Design a protein around this ligand. Structure first.
Ligand SMILES: Nc1ncnc2c1ncn2[C@@H]1O[C@H](COP(=O)(O)OP(=O)(O)NP(=O)(O)O)[C@@H](O)[C@H]1O
Ligand SMILES: Nc1ncnc2c1ncn2[C@@H]1O[C@H](COP(=O)(O)OP(=O)(O)NP(=O)(O)O)[C@@H](O)[C@H]1O
Lengths: 250, 245
């Protein structure tokens, strides 16, 4: 080994090295950190083409940055345009259908170019979240090696740094109280107070319920049952997320 | 409008727009849709969307379709801003970039011999740090929602009273210091509490949002863990746990 890194990450990296060997690899490339990492590893070790599908959901600035970032790392890259907007397909089934249309090109591109595999930049952390398009890519036989090797996001950052891939800066363009929300707050307090016998002092932003409380009550909510009930019911009041302050007051 | 406060703001807008030719800096978002619709119902109005390459086609199309839906006259003007190197600070890149939009809006106002340019900045916005607000002011672009002290709730309420739909979430939908802070928080909790499975630390406004699976959740439940995790994730300078596992 030419880099010294933790054995866990080194095994994952080595698995990637062997997997790409002697393959012609189409990489589904979005320009982000995750798909940049695997594009660079593939291109350093195999005949590789990073393919960006421009379906109208990425601005020119984002597309240009992805192209310049591939050139910077000597990753062969092409941007292929589809007019997906004019071919519409449902309620968020757009996610699956939008991603499926991206998956369907690339599979066309892989067959036209007689390449061997398509890989993407989906990581292990991603498959625990609600991302419908992961199904859509699997249905086109697009492999997620970072997910197969159980890459966390931390593993992506560390491996990127070892391979001297810069984390891209933010476009952005920082810091971000009325009362309906006083009503939601109080009813959330009243609900938990009445149901968990939370006599002691205890719900605070952007429709997110921030709960504060003391240690003695804290042992009561630890059972998942409570949390499952507390998360659904404080969302019935319309809070989109329920969250608990780990700063237990005196 | 069941509220006199909101009724007064609305009436102030109607009175100000009467008999004026109004250019609206229109992005398709809730705020500039609200003032475009009020201008458009009460005055000769043109909603202008500047396509500078930082908005996707989908966003442009949705703004155009949203204008058509509410009978707001609308035009998308494309500029090739990306080809111009004029700024190099993240606050001067914003400022100079927004200046380029403002300058295009001012060109259109003079060419069409219109009277005023208004935008959708609200009162809440001016307390946050957004560089381009300076740039629009320097082109004499007015912020009526800010001048009348619209909060975010006032916009939502007035929109509902005027039957403007609040747009749904976009399909399938961050500095280096905060990526770094988050990453160190994950590393800390994973290594210390044997969180083999999924663990992530989301950051909003320097607040640590911890995410994890049900099976791992049993590990952190004891007060001891939370006391240590709350102090140490503040050592990084951020602490709260998302109850939706
Ligand atoms: N327009 C696109 N063209 C090509 N590949 C794409 C495109 N959009 C997404 N992908 C791929 O699909 C993967 C998963 O999509 P997504 O759920 O949006 O993850 P992601 O957060 O964008 N990953 P990344 O941006 O590379 O760090 C990405 O890592 C890319 O490999
Ligand atoms: N591309 C654009 N073309 C025309 N006007 C624009 C454009 N982008 C922004 N504006 C105007 O500038 C105002 C303030 O900019 P900004 O705060 O970035 O937009 P925004 O849509 O209000 N985002 P947000 O306040 O977070 O909802 C908008 O309300 C619009 O009136």
């Amino acid at each position: 080994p030419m880099i010294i890194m933790e054995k866990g990450l080194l095994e994952k990296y080595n698995s990637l090295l062997e997997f790409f060997k002697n393959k012609k690899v189409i990489v589904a490339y979005s320009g982000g950190v995750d798909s940049t990492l695997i594009s660079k590893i593939a291109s350093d070790n195999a005949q590789t083409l990073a393919v960006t599908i421009d379906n109208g959901f990425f601005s020119e600035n984002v597309i240009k940055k992805a192209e310049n970032r591939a050139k910077k790392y000597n990753i062969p890259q092409k941007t292929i345009k589809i007019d997906y907007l004019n071919e519409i397909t449902d309620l968020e089934n757009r996610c699956y259908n939008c991603k499926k249309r991206i998956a369907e090109e690339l599979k066309r591109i892989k067959n036209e170019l007689n390449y061997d595999i398509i890989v993407d930049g989906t990581i292990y952390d991603d498959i625990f979240e609600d991302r419908p398009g992961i199904k859509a890519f699997n249905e086109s036989n697009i492999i997620s090696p970072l997910s197969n090797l159980k890459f966390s996001k931390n593993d992506v950052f560390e491996l990127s740094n070892y391979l001297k891939i810069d984390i891209p800066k933010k476009d952005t363009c920082t810091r971000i109280p009325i009362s309906e929300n006083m009503a939601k707050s109080n009813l959330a307090e009243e609900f938990i107070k009445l149901n968990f016998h939370i006599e002691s002092y205890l719900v605070r932003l952007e429709n997110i319920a921030i709960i504060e409380l003391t240690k003695n009550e804290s042992e009561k909510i630890f059972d998942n049952d409570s949390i499952e009930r507390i998360n659904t019911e404080l969302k019935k009041i319309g809070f989109e997320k329920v969250v608990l302050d780990l700063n237990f007051k005196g």
